[PDB]
Design a protein around this ligand. Structure first.
Ligand code: TKT
Ligand code: TKT
Ligand code: TKT
Ligand code: TKT
Ligand code: TKT
Lengths: 387, 387, 387, 387, 387
């Protein structure tokens, strides 16, 4: 008769049972050609170690029962038929820890030689072993283990759909300008066998991904070096004035809550510390020895009516280190008492002058070393950033 | 017989198979007319670069098998029939990264000439390439790539349902008073072809959206200019009194945690910085040079029993810059000693008077430049806000 | 026969097709009586402008095909039959932006005259145009636009199920003690027509809801007035002592982070500011002029070895404003020098006495105005709270 | 024949329609015996007033159509059959505001006398009227209103499955060591009737639950009493030294952000305040009067070159309150001037001695009252904690 | 005939009803062999006491109806058939408080002897009784109670699938480098019976899990010991200088907000406190007695024109404790007055010298004990960390 191609659609699917594996010879395995286009990196959760991606996915297999001849069917080559009306392999991921809601595709492509072509996009929220060691400059290596969850090698076998170098190089459409940058998707086929004489069909896909170290530059180093340049200005404040600790203590307090707020950036991975704590606790310790310097010089110079400067450390500091850094009436018994009391204040003032004198030279010399130390530390930072 | 229009409903759908593509000639493609009304901008996630919207969506195609004649069927023109009882095209979005739960519409409209009219609202949570460069004044350009996910150009072809200028101008019902303001929805048809002799039907929709710069005005500039007007009052505090750093340091501390709290407003986009950090770190650096000024003048004036003002910088500052800013008994050997000690304090007081004198003129002159600088900086801010 | 009422259940539903619209005459529209009981206000999201509620909902229509006679069926009046076995109208909401999961009711009520009674509770997460202008005292007006999403006025028409005043007054069961208090649910019927000779059936429901201004009283004004009463105690601290700025600056700092924390209470609506920022930035500015007062009086009184009080402003302040606020040997040449030096300190002390004298009267007079200002400002606050 | 019990399974369910209510006489109501085991309190949301629990639930009713005789069926007593193959009552909760995903149980128990036994666990996220008045020691009373959502008293009637005292006392398995402790689950049956001659079957279950006041003890009182014991140490700091406000102001600042952080513990219920704000703002006000004391004593003692202590308040304080708390040459005209100037400083020093003297006695006496006040306040706290 | 193995697939499943329990003799119970591979620990929620895991799960039972002979069926051994076409036991978990979305496996394995092999991975979000007593070093013991939710011991009985020691030792694939480390999964079978002559089939699985104490080391002790090493440097600051409280108070403030931020790490479990608060409030109290020391020494030394050092405590401190820590004209009547006034200042200066003298020795001696105390406290900390 002549109503449509609809005749063919009935005749093939009249008694077609979608439950039995489609082979005329049951020993011949059904080979499923797989193809991956990685569409987008949604989010990495370093805390739970689970990566969520979106994949444009494809399936190709051979159904020997629905084959027909192009002739006497009005030369039709391929036909679209509902997915839930035909046998479908159960390819999923072993790393599955959840189910992303992805649009359900109702149709598949069948040609006259019995090949079924199945396209569907899937959202996989899968667990991945992450190494966050070099936090700003990290490459990450996540496994995507494709398997039929039950079928054997004599039933279902996995092959590539095309040449494995192009899928590696495939950067066709992937959304850039995000947190992650795709380098390559490396395919690898393997026979896994958890049980003796029971091996199941596996095709590993190593997608290796690099973070873009821009958000974590500004959010980490910029206030940090800011806190450095404010303190260097602060060293110029004289210690005797009394504001010397009041500068630094509020600054150390400011650095304390600063490191506590940024503590919720680095993840709660129980593998240990990130390496950037080393690049930060050095800076933390740097302020301590600055603080240790600060109270020391305020401990030296003060008016406490105490000891005179010992000559041994006067020549070493006020002389040697200065050159190194630069390059009858009874009225008489009462008048005698007043100047005697007077010169005692003048002498303690003489004490006040010399201890103050050494301290400023000491303050300047200890100031010189710290600025040179940070600049040398800074030149190490930028040479590491360049390499 | 005469029970109802129900007769027609059976007779058409008696043997109607919803699986085969509805054409009497299989080579003639089924043309699907699409129509978009963008209903609402739900939320932009700049972090993951994914935009979620709600669309009032429509479908129009031709089913040649369910056509009938208005006569002998009691002059019925159109009939409502269940969606899951007829063939439905698989139009979805390539940018799909998730599935929004949207009400499932059970019925579609069929007229006697076989045209199927399908209305359904859909929630699309789709990834979009965002450019957040000019953060308060940004236009955003997001793609909505409509496609049949598998069908060819010889099966499914995409056309507009009406004239493409009205859908552009369509601001009919869209919810304003939100974070985003709709400018236009620009449609564009294209033939995409990832494979040779395999092209698939595509209709791009560029919806271009503008943020409303009101929430980010108050939340950014108002405390910022507030922190400016409190410091200008603070410059009037005398440096010798000792409170001079205590004002500014707490203020700089206050500005430090202020910028850390607002750091979680700007997103974690790894494309680099927003431009508003330039409009902010300038203000940040402005306080530094204020702080640098502050400790400098406190370094100048202090009572440390040291050097007298050099005349070369006395004429340049206390004289030139002042005019520029304004426009036999042995009792004698003891009495000789007391005034000698006395005038030493008076002389260091003479030292205390002159160094204090220059500093206040210096404080006032350096004060004049900063207020003029901020006001000039402010007049640049408002002229940019007007343009 | 006599097995049960089950006979009737078969006989009616034997050939009953749930797909065709149930009318013997196709031109007669099926009228759907709607009824609303608003059960609870779950949450308002001012950010995205979307209101989520729970409704106890009802449907009433006429199915002319399943009518029967009470006689010869053992006098049965009504019968419960599965929802998915009969035709159901598609009434939904145009404001739908999402789908709340609500229990699916499997059965409906059918009486012998063919009326189908459908009860089901639904969770609607719908977008609503909000006006948060008067933030503590706001009434909100949200639309619930009920429509058949496709059917015409000749097929489906919407009526009330009972008198529209009772549903307005309906406060039967609604959960109080929550964030929102139900005033009324105002129904309104309208014919909307987006297209010429194509109008679709609409029944608007304006539910108008009021917030309960109790959580936002304590969370806003109580620490705010607290910060006021601590500063009034602080004005009594003498400015010369040096602690004068140290009080207020920490207090201004405390007020700075206070306003930053409460900044995440008011929503990110891009319609502009809430009005309560006016009721807050006034208080913010109030501390500034207090701070401006504070440094001013500390700028007046200090020991800087400078100018004497000018008489013109001495009579205006120390005299006029005080009454307004209250209501041969050569030993002689050396002894001459010591008192000469001595009286210079005594004279600068004389300078220290008078400048201090004016300042305290000045401090007290400027103190009087501010307390009267806040109390007058406070009496404005409570008279607004009463109205 | 003899294949299995499968014969019975067919014979009963051959023509069994799951849509019609299972009664041979339609007037006899189907009585559904209900049983509740409350398994766990998941979370209380005081903000939205909605309680989420997990219930082990049971259903018992009578199906007169599937009854059979144990004989000639190989003495089978009960049989397991799929839930979706038989009629199931629609018992749900009126307080339903959402749907928790709970495992779907596929089978039910049928015995030969036609009784259907239905077990299924359900997750109910239901709205509950909460009273958070006594925040640490609260009992909460939540309603669980079980109803058939449509069926009448002549169709479905609700009874207990066993004696109502055991379900009350039922603490069998419930998970302790959580935020909530189960006291009892009180059942109550009632006929509700919203409409005249239309009453629907209701069985109320009052589960009354108590919080465990341990997390909120440490998180509230421990830092609070800590802030008390640090201030009592702070009162010993002398006011003249200048650090007196600097202690307390930072402490008051610390208490200010402390109360702001703990402000997000108490919920946003619009019923008013919790009672614990009274137990906290008293402590808040306690520091104010301490602060008021602090600036007062610093206002008393200072060196401002002003008034002498009035005798009336010298006897009342330095005398009475002290005992209460404890239990020819012209050289002469110049020499005359110097001591005259000298004794003026000594006299103002005499002023400095006496005003300082009264203040410390005043500081100690005002110190005594505050420590006794807090200890008395503390003894009130612990006697309330014991009762 | 010879089309395929498809013949067998029909012949077995032609009249196979998936609703009746598959036994030829109804008294013989169907034994379900269970097997567990625990795949990953997703997240522990100590707040609600609910553990979420992912399990690779297996089912094994015997279907006596679908048995066949390998001969005359082309020697086929096993066959894959759809899950929803055969009877499936209802094994779930009693601890279920929610439903995780896990991929639905469509097929199961049937061999010719009638054994059905069911593989499926499941996500179980289940409530677990947690003991967080030793917070960094905790072992946790969670129950996984596997049961058929309704079937009796005469219908369904639970056995292991293999030897119970290997499943215990099974560390095959589990994802390490996470928050939790798998020690063992201990299986145990038990007959539970809530009702007399009604016992239901139970197999308990105790998985015992250990946290990895690395994230909570750095996040707790590192800033804490940091706050210790900054204070020890702070003790060297002299108390007379006035900065003595200003150091510690800001530090105590810094420690106050530090403990408030880390307060949201420990959970809100109402079982009481964690033990680590003891290891922290000791450190908290340590700063108090440091603060108590700080104000004490500032209370001792000050210039208040008061009492002389009593000899009894001078020998005990300045002598004994110092050695323990180290190892005619009328001009005369006026001149008489000036030195008399002069020596009064010198004498109060003599008072200023001695009280200052004792305090520094006192400051140093009290300094020695605290450093030894923390180091002894520290050596207790590290010996506990080693054990
Ligand atoms: C319209 N869509 C466009 C083109 C057809 C449809 C589905 C998408 O393509 C793929 O399916 C492929 C992904 N990766 C592949 C690799 C080899 C062949 C096809 C694809 C993008
Ligand atoms: C009741 N609803 C009202 C009117 C009918 C129903 C569905 C909505 O309209 C649309 O479907 C359209 C959206 N965009 C369009 C463009 C051209 C024609 C129709 C629509 C709003
Ligand atoms: C047990 N439930 C109780 C009473 C029957 C069942 C369903 C609920 O009532 C409604 O359906 C109505 C809501 N609003 C209405 C308005 C008019 C008539 C009925 C209702 C509450
Ligand atoms: C294995 N599970 C165990 C025992 C059977 C199965 C289901 C649960 O028990 C219940 O269903 C009951 C709850 N509450 C009840 C009250 C009276 C009778 C039974 C139950 C726990
Ligand atoms: C491909 N997948 C690989 C191997 C087959 C498929 C399913 C997984 O294995 C299991 O099902 C088992 C888990 N635990 C077990 C214990 C004994 C036997 C099998 C398993 C991993």
């Amino acid at each position: 008769t002549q109503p449509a191609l609809l005749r063919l659609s009935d005749h093939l699917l009249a008694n077609y049972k979608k439950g039995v594996r489609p082979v005329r010879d049951w020993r011949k395995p059904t080979t499923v050609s797989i193809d991956v286009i990685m569409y987008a990196i949604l989010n990495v959760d370093e805390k739970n170690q689970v990566l969520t991606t979106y994949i444009w996915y494809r399936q190709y297999w051979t159904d020997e029962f629905l084959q027909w001849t192009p002739e006497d069917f009005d030369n039709v080559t391929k036909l679209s038929i509902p997915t839930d009306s035909i046998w479908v392999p159960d390819i999923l991921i072993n790393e599955f820890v959840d189910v992303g809601k992805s649009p359900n595709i109702p149709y598949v492509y069948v040609h006259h030689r019995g090949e079924v072509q199945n396209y569907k996009p899937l959202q996989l929220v899968t667990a991945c072993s992450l190494d966050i060691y070099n936090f700003p400059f990290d490459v990450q290596n996540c496994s995507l283990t494709f398997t039929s969850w039950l079928h054997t090698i004599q039933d279902i076998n996995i092959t590539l759909w095309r040449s494995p170098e192009e899928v590696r190089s495939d950067k066709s459409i992937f959304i850039n300008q995000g947190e992650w940058e795709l380098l390559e998707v490396f395919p690898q086929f393997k026979e896994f066998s958890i049980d003796i004489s029971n091996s199941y069909a596996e095709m590993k896909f190593y997608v290796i991904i690099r973070r873009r170290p821009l958000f974590y530059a500004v959010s980490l180093l910029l206030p940090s070096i800011f806190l450095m340049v404010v303190d260097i200005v602060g060293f110029c404040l004289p210690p005797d004035s009394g504001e010397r600790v009041s500068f630094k203590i509020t600054l150390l307090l400011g650095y304390s809550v600063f490191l506590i707020i940024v503590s919720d950036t680095l993840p709660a991975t129980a593998i240990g510390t990130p390496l950037i704590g080393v690049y930060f606790v050095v800076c933390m310790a740097l302020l301590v020895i600055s603080l240790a310097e600060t109270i020391f010089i305020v401990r030296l110079v003060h008016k406490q009516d105490l000891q005179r400067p010992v000559p041994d450390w006067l020549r070493h500091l006020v002389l040697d280190r200065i050159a190194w850094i630069l390059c009858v009436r009874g009225l008489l018994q009462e008048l005698s008492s007043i100047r005697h009391f007077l010169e005692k204040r003048d002498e303690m003032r003489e004490v006040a002058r010399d201890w103050l004198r050494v301290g400023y030279v000491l303050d300047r010399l200890l100031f010189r070393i710290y600025l040179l130390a940070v600049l040398a530390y800074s030149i190490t930072l930028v040479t590491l950033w360049s390499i």
